[PDB]
């Protein structure tokens, strides 16, 4: 319930960025935070955690993302 | 070569039991070819329809890695809107194996129905959902024959 | 109006059909046949002009043999033009080469279209001739080379229109939004590629109805993903769709006479690092002619200071006459003019080959008008090629002539430096177009002619009659012989000094021939020069040069574009450290339908036969295939079910596949996703990169539908060994029509594996039955290979509303043919030899070397400093990521190898591989560890690969991953196991 926590995010080129966030932050809020730090347009990349595509409407606590977790960045359109 | 050297560093990072992702069981073909990987795809998500499955696949890296995208093929082929009848799946283009494999399990639960390859599975995903779930559940159970002996898989 | 597309195949893809037809109606006159003259004449004759005429009544001197490859010691005394015309006509039987005897009356220039004046024409005569050409509409082009310097002049008359500026394909792309202010927004993650000043037409714009009529709009680039065309409020409002195509508008450019340009020149810079030296050399080359007038046609003496100081005065006197050249407040740069006077008598092959190809391309633009011509002037120098005076000093004694053919080369570098060039041991990989130009320049340099040097050239290919256009060392008499062997004897006739010094081999460079090119071969060489055409071989030679720490001179051309790369050990990076799928399903360009048709051509006539040939010859194939299975079993079932008997059955199979691939599968796709289908978000399914297809109704009178059946039937008949009375050169429509009009075509209706494995007949049923798989050949025009891919691709193009392509355009995309013109090949080869001068001095200053990039279409010349090899570190120990490696002596054991790395290097070896074979891994189970930890490196490879290391192998390259003293992975060099 609103506990501070830092999480890691892996990019496509196996590079890890460290972010300081809270469980009361939406994925869209976090996705916009990775946008300004890496340079990727918002439409090109999404976020996957333990094989779960994070929707922009939910928050970090909605996906049971505790402290020192690792997010993953994947293209939005990648199907054959 | 800069291709075999790059493949080694990514093969050790995905098979070291300290950094290994529990969602994929990676082993080399004949334990000697670095450019041919036998990967076992597992969906650990409990709410997913593909839960409990072990879908065997094969990755073949070309000689011009990473300047050419590698091929990914399900053996055997699975029912998915983004998988050809040949079992193969298009890999797009600086990219790592970890990003590609994670991109694959993400497509398994959220298929890109707008750009379909199996038109049968695509029309079944949206128009006949009950039939698509039945084809996947039957596909997951037939996958249990492709388990080795002694392997345990947690949720973690 | 016919063009030999068998001889000019690679050249037609550069110049086009229309431009080559104008070239075949233009008579070219070249004045002066020194090294620069014969280099221009060779490339122009090879390019195929209507007629070639040369004029040079001067007697052949031994010093002229410095750059002219068509002169021998036996020709000394006779006229340069007469002895060269014979050897020039041999290059192209379609181009007659004549000799103009006396140019006393200038009215003889009226029968020519392009006049070329080389260095043998005085500046006073160049102006007299240009005044007659400019006032008569004749194109005038001049050029001269002074040592390591040179320039060129272009005057194409007072009226010249550039219809095509670049010769490239017009850039096109899809539009996602057109704002009312004109901001044309592209689709997601697509770059328009346009630049300011471009012009574009529009298509498929739903709402701006008057925007699609073909009116052109000026492009104002806002960013890499958008451009602006002005307010489009008059045309309506944007809804969806849109495809823009760049259109090249004509540009009528006006030229000034040579007299006008000497006073107010317009420069085109060959190197922006030396863009100030342009106006300096403009007065220097003029002063060289004033010096010749004041000295009875004499040039400034070699390394002479009295003449060099007089030239500086003439340049200063000219600066007062022409104050616009240098401009106000800029000094004369006496040091530059002094170097120009020192080399005024030099004849450098690298500079001649450079300007020879450059001016020749300007002659081609003069006859065809295909590219953008040179804007009135360009100057170029390669002063960085001069060796260090501390090792090879230059003065009036070292650079004096020695009564040899290299006198004009010694005049620049000195006698001691030319001896080292002759004592160099070089390796030329490939004897193609670049290799032929490479051996010619090395023959003029005398490279390898010394008692300590040699030349090794290897090429496993033979000479063909079609290659005689792009390979000028070969003649019709040599077709069928080996490329490297004939090119060896070709240069020995130009310079007999190389006789017995060229080792011509016919062996392919690769891992297959590591016994022939062993350690003793590579280590004895000084440097290696690449003359290859494919990337697979280039990377191997590059990885070999990195292993043995030898310099590599890399080059390559693509049409009018070309580049050079210098690779220095321990200093710069190598050539390896530099530089769809969905599109087949939803095509929007002709490239995607060809890739779809090319893959269909493989599964029809190549993969189906290999599966049947293996199902019949391997008994366990059914059980072996279980390790794609349904597609393979279906391929063998369809290949043995509809087995054709005569050629009439093959026509039926091709017509049925036409209905399946282009009518039924399209209706089945349109059944699941109609033209009005919508996605989850409510967006139209068929939008943007996706085009709603339409089913094809077969029409035998449609050229693409007809040839899909002819080629499809002829190729299937080749698989099943069926022959026909039809002519393989001309199919008859009425015969194919009576066969199809009597067929019953099934209508369309919308739609485990152990059953399939039981439907296959036994191999014993078909005893001796063999299918002949089709081996794809792009260069044969009678095997129906290109006929199928062209017809099949255009049919799918008709489905998705893509514009069809002809055979020549499809052969280009399918075969991945690299265009090659003779002008860029000679120019690029010259730049390689100018860097070769820097390899002889063993220069280590990275700024002295220069990587070149040329685009003769603009024309653009740019040079960049080579990139230094990236450095890394482990345990605070810096190393070179490209060149550094670990040297281990003896066939060490795996256990002692890890011990040597934890003690001497502090690295815990976690993995170890040998080529493409993984040998050791720290995460192996204790069973795999103890088994391999006690084996040496040679026995470790035998255990893993089941193959023995041959006795001719003396070294082994091992890739390793290791952790530092903190337990984290760190990049480390590779290992060389010295057996
Ligand atoms: N691996 C190789 N070994 C020997 N020669 C080669 C190799 N690859 C290409 N070549 C030669 O390189 C030449 C290609 O140059 P070009 O004719 O200009 O395309 C031909 O003579 C080929 O036979």
Author numbering:
A (entry chain N): -3 to 76
B (entry chain J): 6 to 98, 118 to 180
C (entry chain I): 12 to 590, 599 to 646, 650 to 773, 797 to 1024
Show the paper's wording:
E1 enzymes function as gatekeepers of Ub signaling by specifically catalyzing activation and transfer of Ub to tens of cognate E2 conjugating enzymes. During E1-catalyzed activation, the C-terminus of Ub is adenylated and subsequently becomes linked via thioester bond to a catalytic cysteine residue on E110,11. This is followed by the recruitment of E2 conjugating enzymes and the transfer of Ub from the E1 catalytic cysteine to the E2 catalytic cysteine in a process called E1–E2 thioester transfer (or transthioesterification). Previous structural studies have shown that Ub E1 is a multidomain enzyme in which each domain plays a distinct functional role in its three catalytic activities of adenylation, thioester bond formation, and transthioesterification.
Using an approach that involves the generation of a stable E2–Ub thioester intermediate mimetic and covalent trapping of the E1 and E2–Ub(t) mimetic active sites in proximity to each other, we here determine the structure of a S. cerevisiae E1(Uba1)–E2(Cdc34)–Ub(t) complex. The ATP binding pocket of seven Uba1–Cdc34–Ub(t) complexes harbored strong electron density into which AMP (but not the β and γ phosphates of ATP) could unambiguously be placed. Much to our surprise, two distinct architectures of the Uba1–Cdc34–Ub(t) thioester mimetic complex are observed in the crystallographic asymmetric unit, with the differences largely centered on the positioning of Ub(t) relative to a fixed Uba1–Cdc34 module. In four copies of the Uba1–Cdc34–Ub(t) complex Ub(t) adopts an open conformation similar to E2–Ub(t)OPEN structures, extending away from the Uba1 and Cdc34 active sites where it engages in a network of contacts to the FCCH domain on the front of Uba1. In stark contrast to the Uba1–Cdc34–Ub(t)OPEN complex, Ub(t) adopts a drastically different closed conformation in the other four copies of the Uba1–Cdc34–Ub(t) complex in the asymmetric unit, projecting backward from the Uba1 and Cdc34 active sites and engaging in extensive contacts with the front surface of Cdc34. In both the Uba1–Cdc34–Ub(t)OPEN and Uba1–Cdc34–Ub(t)CLOSED complexes, electron density corresponding to the isopeptide bond between A141K of Cdc34 and Gly76 of Ub(t) and the disulfide bonds between the Uba1 and Cdc34 active site cysteines used to stabilize the Uba1–Cdc34 interface are all well-ordered.
